[PDB]
Amino acid sequence: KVFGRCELAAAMKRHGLDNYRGYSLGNWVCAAKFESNFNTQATNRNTDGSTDYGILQINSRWWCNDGRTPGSRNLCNIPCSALLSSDITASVNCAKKIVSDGNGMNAWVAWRNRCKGTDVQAWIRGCRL
Numbered sequence: 001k002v003f004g005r006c007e008l009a010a011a012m013k014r015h016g017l018d019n020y021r022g023y024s025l026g027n028w029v030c031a032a033k034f035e036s037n038f039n040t041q042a043t044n045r046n047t048d049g050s051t052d053y054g055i056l057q058i059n060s061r062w063w064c065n066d067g068r069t070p071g072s073r074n075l076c077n078i079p080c081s082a083l084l085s086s087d088i089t090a091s092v093n094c095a096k097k098i099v100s101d102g103n104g105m106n107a108w109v110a111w112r113n114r115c116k117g118t119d120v121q122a123w124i125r126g127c128r129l
């Protein structure tokens with residue numbers, strides 16, 4: 001599924017991401033835009049052989065199992081394919097564990113380079129929430 005901007009904002013809000021660990025809704029929408037272009041089916045492979053999955057591009061090296069990343073962990077205890085569903089529940093629940101692990105949203109490279117320190121409120125402007 002390819003979400004619309006306001007559609008994804010409303011979905012994330014319903015799943016408890018607004019101000020989660022102090023990060024306003026606009027931060028999450030901005031990260032999703034630049035990680036996956038709002039596409040739940042996005043995949044990208046990394047140099048070390050791990051793969052990133054879904055709307056928030058969660059890495060198989062640490063967070064999910066894809067059966068082809070040797071010596072990796074599965075800290076969200078899910079198959080990586082569950083992160084590609086049109087229902088974003090699994091992606092959101094895993095993201096909540098990632099953002100709580102001490103480094104906040106700096107875990108997402110696109111957020112650090114393209115969202116951090118910008119006016120992220122603009123990403124939810126005009127949406128009915």
Ligand SMILES: [Cl-]
Nearest residue numbers: 022103104105
């Ligand atoms: Cl933080």
